[PDB]
């Protein structure tokens, strides 16, 4: 034949750390501590594991087994299972094109912060700057100061009016134009992800070595630093303080379910592609287990890293850790945490390692996020592609750059919130629901347990089988139904989103998966004979 076989992993630890670097990102660092504190406190640990063990782990392991079994991309694997669902592999691609439009610009912000951290005096410390207003009031200033409704801090001014420059846009209506600095930063990032991908899984496992390991070292340094800060016990108390009346609310369980689902990130075909290159007799169980546990515990220690510094901040201000933690989002890291860094000795050091930590946290997850789609299209169009892998990887990277120009405008953050909450999220949950239903109720769970019996030598236990048959599809269905029933009201930076925002996100969300139903109609209209025979060739593998 022309091309006999595909590649594999250079070492077990390389992909073992590659899937972990994929699963570990900013959300583990910030999103989990906040949602853990405001819901139940430490008591949030109980439902977070239940939604993991029952909901998250069977989707992570079921997603990870099919990749190491079929060794096909996100697209070509459906031709071998349920060809009518092949559009899933395309939908994810389109979905990826939306996700890459924002998720990289955050690292662009962290990079603009990193290159601005090389000065002996950090820019967000002092209030004398070209971008600051008269409302700017900092510390090392006159005492007795009282905050005003219109007053703003120099870190808030630095993020708002300088790097983001969001004061130059009135909202989603007029966000123009584009900022060139963040365009250069995101160009450097699209360059650093290019050289970590283009050579295939060889470099993506080697570059992961640095990107996965560094955030843990930085979290250790920031943990020892935050533990020595006075009054840090307030953020730890507010973090672990049990509230058992929260478990009675039906909302916090849905929050934990969505949090663990997105934190593990199954059903996107990334784990499918990472498992596609591996040994056939290699163990899926121990891998998925260890990786998931490492991710969750990483979020757990990230909680301490955040809340020691926020407790020190609530000690420098007056208590009420919910007040300094009021804002949930990048402003917690880029304003609150950063302003807490500027007040500490060796502030240049702790700022550099912090922003570098953020960049390393997003970079590996981006490596894998592109790796699943690139593997999907290369496996779907073999030998018509792979003529050069760097050609296709570059063709994807540049397209993602032009797709991120909408996010690089002055009002880009609004588009970040809109795309993440109202568009990408519900469609990723949706396509993951279609996959969980398709593998269990079409290809069958018994044949899946037989394939696991072939790879591992033994059939999976009844605990996992009963999870794939029932618990997991209802686990995603609960989240999708909860979101569609009551979409949350979006607010960012003293600005409320228009009522039609949900129309736009849905319009962007629906336009991603338009391909799967029209593809089902494509194979339904293409296959001759009776519709039962067409759906028989569609149900039976090829």
């Amino acid at each position: 034949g022309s091309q006999g076989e595909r590649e594999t992993w250079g070492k077990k630890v390389d992909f073992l750390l590659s899937v972990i670097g994929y699963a570990v990102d900013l959300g583990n660092v910030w999103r989990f501590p906040y949602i853990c504190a405001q819901n139940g406190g430490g008591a949030f640990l109980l439902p977070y594991t239940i939604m993991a063990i029952f909901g998250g782990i069977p989707l992570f392991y079921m997603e990870l087994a099919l990749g190491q079994y079929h060794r096909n991309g996100c697209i070509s694997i459906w031709r071998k299972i349920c060809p009518i669902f092949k559009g899933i592999g395309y939908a994810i691609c389109i979905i990826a094109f939306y996700i890459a439009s924002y998720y990289n610009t955050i690292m662009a912000w962290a990079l603009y912060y990193l290159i601005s951290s090389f000065t002996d005096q950090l820019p967000w410390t002092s209030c004398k700057n070209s971008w600051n207003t008269g409302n700017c009031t900092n510390y090392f200033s006159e005492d007795n100061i009282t905050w005003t409704l219109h007053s703003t801090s120099p870190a808030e001014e630095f993020y708002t009016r300088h790097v983001l420059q969001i004061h130059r846009s009135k909202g989603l209506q007029d966000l123009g134009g584009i900022s060139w600095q963040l365009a250069l930063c995101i160009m450097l990032i699209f360059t650093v992800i290019y050289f970590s991908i283009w050579k295939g899984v060889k470099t993506s496992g080697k570059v992961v070595w640095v990107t996965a390991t560094f955030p843990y070292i930085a979290l250790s340094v920031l943990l020892v630093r935050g533990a020595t800060l006075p009054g840090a016990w307030r953020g730890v108390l507010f973090y672990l303080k049990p509230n058992w009346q929260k478990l009675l609310e039906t909302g916090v369980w849905i929050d934990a379910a969505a949090q663990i689902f997105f934190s593990l990130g199954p059903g996107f075909g990334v784990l499918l592609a990472f498992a596609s290159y591996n040994k056939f007799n290699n163990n899926c169980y121990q891998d998925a287990l260890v990786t998931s546990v490492v991710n969750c515990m990483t979020s757990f220690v990230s909680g301490f890293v955040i809340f020691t510094v926020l407790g020190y901040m609530a000690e420098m201000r007056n208590e009420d850790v919910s007040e300094v933690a009021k804002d949930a989002g990048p402003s917690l890291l880029f304003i609150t945490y950063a302003e807490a860094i500027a007040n500490m000795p060796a502030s240049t050091f702790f700022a550099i390692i912090f922003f570098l930590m953020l960049i390393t946290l997003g970079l590996d997850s981006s490596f894998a996020g592109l790796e699943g789609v690139i593997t999907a299209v290369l496996d779907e169009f073999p030998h018509v592609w792979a003529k050069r892998r760097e050609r296709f990887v570059l063709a994807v990277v540049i397209t993602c750059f032009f797709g991120s120009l909408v996010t690089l405008t002055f009002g880009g953050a609004y588009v970040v919130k809109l795309l993440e909450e109202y568009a990408t999220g519900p469609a990723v949950l949706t396509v993951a629901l279609i996959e969980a239903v398709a593998v269990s109720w079409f290809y069958g769970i018994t044949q899946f347990c037989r394939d696991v019996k072939e790879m591992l030598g033994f059939s999976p236990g009844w605990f996992w089988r009963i999870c794939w048959v029932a618990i997991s599809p209802l686990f995603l269905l609960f989240i999708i139904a909860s979101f569609l029933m009551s979409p949350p009201q979006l607010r960012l930076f003293q600005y409320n989103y228009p009522y039609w925002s949900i129309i736009l996100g849905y319009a962007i969300g629906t336009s991603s998966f338009i391909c799967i139903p029209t593809y089902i109609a494509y194979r339904l209209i293409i296959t001759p004979g009776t519709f039962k025979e067409r759906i028989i060739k569609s149900i039976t593998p090829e």
Epitope: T148, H150, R317, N318, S322
Partner: antibody, heavy 119, light 108 residues
Framework: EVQLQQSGPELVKPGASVKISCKAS????????MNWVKQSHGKSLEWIGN????????SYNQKFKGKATLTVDKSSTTAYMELRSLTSEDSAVYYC????????????WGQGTTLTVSS | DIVMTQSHKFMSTSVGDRVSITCKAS??????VAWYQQKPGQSPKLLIY???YRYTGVPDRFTGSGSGTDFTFTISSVQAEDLAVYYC?????????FGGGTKLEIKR
Amino acid sequence: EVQLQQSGPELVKPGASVKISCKASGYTFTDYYMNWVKQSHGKSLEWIGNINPNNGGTSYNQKFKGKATLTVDKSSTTAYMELRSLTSEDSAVYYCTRSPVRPYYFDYWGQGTTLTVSS
Amino acid sequence: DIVMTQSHKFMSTSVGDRVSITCKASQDVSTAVAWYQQKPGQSPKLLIYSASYRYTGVPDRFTGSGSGTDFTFTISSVQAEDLAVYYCQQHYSIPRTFGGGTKLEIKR
């Protein structure tokens, strides 16, 4: 010359509603939170809730949730508090007081409003 | 929520005597406490804010101290116009709560 001038006393039958105003002067009205404190006869002070005059952003107390409603008018720089479902417990002296964002304290108070709910 | 507990509902003192009022809170308040003075028939007047600090227009004879759950409001020279009801309040956590109040009666 910061002055908060409230309305006069009110006598209302139980089950009715009542509205009390606050007229702020001597300071920039958009710079500070406006608050209302209920003081029962012989009892201590009780914080009802505040409001942001710029957008009128309301922050209430869980005890007063569904009880008092706060509004604001920037044209006349005047704050309002409305009470529905009046009972004998609602008879008390009410105040409107200015407060900053931080540290949170009541620097200037209104002269007070004596409310009597009876038939 | 937060419970500001004033154990002494009434305290006796004489003109010129040094008087102090204690304020017991629920949890650890750090430095955030406010002392208000309400004269009979008048609206409350802010005296002390954030532990030791004094508000503008407050005479030097009024002081405050303590960092913790317990706080102390101290008056050195008591005058005849110093007769009023004193309150302590925590401004950190929502909602803001007040103590039971301590009515200071003058002995002569």
